[PDB]
Amino acid sequence: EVQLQQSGAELVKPGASVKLSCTASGFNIKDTFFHWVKQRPEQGLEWIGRIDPADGHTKYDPKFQGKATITADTSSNTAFLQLSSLTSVDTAVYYCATTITPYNAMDYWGQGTSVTVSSASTTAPSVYPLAPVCGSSVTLGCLVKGYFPEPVTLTWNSGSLSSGVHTFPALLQSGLYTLSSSVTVTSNTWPSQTITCNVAHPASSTKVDKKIEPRV
Amino acid sequence: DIVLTQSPASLAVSLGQRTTISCRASESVDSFDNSFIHWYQQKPGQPPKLLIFLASSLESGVPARFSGSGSRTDFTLTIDPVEADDAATYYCQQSNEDPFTFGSGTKLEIKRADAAPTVSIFPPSSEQLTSGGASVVCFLNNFYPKDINVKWKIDGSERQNGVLNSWTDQDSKDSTYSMSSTLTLTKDEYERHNSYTCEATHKTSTSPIVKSFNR
């Protein structure tokens, strides 16, 4: 097994450019072909192009000629995608991937980088703990209200509480994104054990923790 | 460009059944030796996962419930037996010709027995009220099928303005759905009313499930 680690989410003004990275561990990037793949929200997959890091050779879908520039750096074992003169249609998740060690399948994929093209500024979320109204199981919540752009990452107790969790996809409301999450535990678990919602929002460089506390 | 047409666009299959998905190419994707067709599974928020390469080879680490077949223009992905973890979108992709292209995907849903939602209501947090806001949240959790109706009543009047409804993707373990309904008011508007009700109407009963609180 190997790992492809992509750079973090980015908010880009229309007309500006951005450069994404894809750092490989466990193998030499010269021994494969790298690909970049675009996925617009709720849409399918679009192959942008590929590079052979052993010699830099590239091949693009003509649709992306001029828009996309793929490079690689063997010194840092990293592949790159530069997107130029961005417009709203460039808002997407971008993936890097490698070919089975260019005509075979893509067997390893990065985690994706969210790129949002917008004139709107970053807005950090307001994170609210949701305790039950003032049985054998109890359901707690976390409301992540009014942020821009996507994504956020939400965990419970820093990820150690993962069973019984429902994290609801973010949606636009009132010009910003709102997301929520519930966790259900046994009534002997809470409030006896502390349960905390942890929310990170890369664009605003914020990281907040909200402990769920019984109402009074 | 090679156009890959997948069928069906969506399907529901029960646990333990076999199913097949079709991928048809606009021109041949073959050499003398291989068909350059690959299949991927994708769940929302995750990258695609390779299942089958070169039409019929099972990717290392993938369960031997996935198999692929076909040549020339007509390709098939088989899942046998289907498990709950298979709820996902499936894509085919060709690499015989540049540009590489993908099909538009097949969304696989798991069919299971109907389940009523577990409903929980949450008044605005004290912190949100300090900020001058007020959202009322209702979770409708672990129900089936996905179709469900949520209504908000404030002091006996139904309200849809300001309601935000978000469904989870189908659960990879129990194949249920969950949904979050948030009624967002201003705080000055919230504390002028006292009765707040989330009502869940689902095919598992003609009478709605009602959760309420008094401010």
Author numbering:
A (entry chain H): 1 to 52, 52A, 53 to 82, 82A, 82B, 82C, 83 to 97, 100C, ...
B (entry chain L): 1 to 27, 27A, 27B, 27C, 27D, 28 to 211
Q: What wording appears in the published article?
A:
RSV is sensitive to neutralization by antibodies directed against F. Neutralizing antibodies target six known antigenic sites: two of which (sites Ø and V) are considered pre-F-specific and four of which (sites I, II, III and IV) are available to various extents on both pre-F and post-F14. 5C4 was elicited in mice immunized with DNA and recombinant adenovirus expressing RSV F, and was identified by screening hybridomas for neutralizing activity (positive selection) and binding to recombinant post-F (negative selection), where each of these steps utilized F protein sequences derived exclusively from subtype A virus. We show that 5C4 potently neutralizes a panel of RSV subtype A strains, yet poorly neutralizes subtype B strains, whereas D25 potently neutralizes strains of both RSV subtypes.
To define the 5C4 epitope on RSV F, the crystal structures of 5C4 alone and in complex with RSV F were determined.
